[PDB]
């Protein structure tokens, strides 16, 4: 199908997310992100990984 | 939000020479500016040409 499936605008497939705040404990390591899904997008969380 | 990188840098660009030639055009390059370490390489004209 040619229409109403895939956009023709500027949009990346994979996005890189850097931690907003992190913590390096002696036994753990925390990483807090902003998983910002933009306008008119869907994100299946199976594609997300660290 | 997206971390869409606005810097697309190419290996066959010369950013340094683009800035050395830029300060030639928009200013008296013989003047010394210690803050950007702006002091142009200049030989002595009696040493190069005897």
Curated annotation (Swiss-Prot), chain A:
Induction: Expressed in the late phase of the viral replicative cycle. It is found in: Virion; Host nucleus. Disulfide bonds: none annotated. Transmembrane segments: none annotated. Homotrimer. Interacts with the capsid vertex protein; this interaction binds the peripentonal hexons to the neighboring penton base. Interacts with the hexon-linking protein; this interaction tethers the hexons surrounding the penton to those situated in the central plate of the facet. Interacts with the hexon-interlacing protein; this interaction lashes the hexons together. Interacts with host dyneins DYNC1LI1 and DYNC1I2; this interaction might be involved in intracellular microtubule-dependent transport of incoming viral capsid. Major capsid protein that self-associates to form 240 hexon trimers, each in the shape of a hexagon, building most of the pseudo T=25 capsid. Assembled into trimeric units with the help of the chaperone shutoff protein. Transported by pre-protein VI to the nucleus where it associates with other structural proteins to form an empty capsid. Might be involved, through its interaction with host dyneins, in the intracellular microtubule-dependent transport of incoming viral capsid to the nucleus. All late proteins expressed from the major late promoter are produced by alternative splicing and alternative polyadenylation of the same gene giving rise to non-overlapping ORFs. A leader sequence is present in the N-terminus of all these mRNAs and is recognized by the viral shutoff protein to provide expression although conventional translation via ribosome scanning from the cap has been shut off in the host cell. Belongs to the adenoviridae hexon protein family. This is Hexon protein. The lineage of its organism: Viruses, Varidnaviria, Bamfordvirae, Preplasmiviricota, Tectiliviricetes. The chain holds residues 52 to 101 of 952 of the full protein.
């Amino acid at each position: 199908p040619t229409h109403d499936v895939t956009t023709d605008r500027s949009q990346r497939l994979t996005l890189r997310f850097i931690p907003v705040d992190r913590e390096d404990t002696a036994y753990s390591y925390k990483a807090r992100f902003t998983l910002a899904v933009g306008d008119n997008r869907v994100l299946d969380m199976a594609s997300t990984y660290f | 939000a997206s971390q869409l990188n606005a810097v697309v840098d190419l290996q066959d660009r010369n950013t340094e020479l683009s800035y050395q030639l830029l300060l030639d055009s928009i200013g008296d390059r013989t003047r010394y500016f210690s803050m950007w370490n702006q002091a142009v390489d200049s030989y002595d004209p009696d040493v190069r040409i005897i």
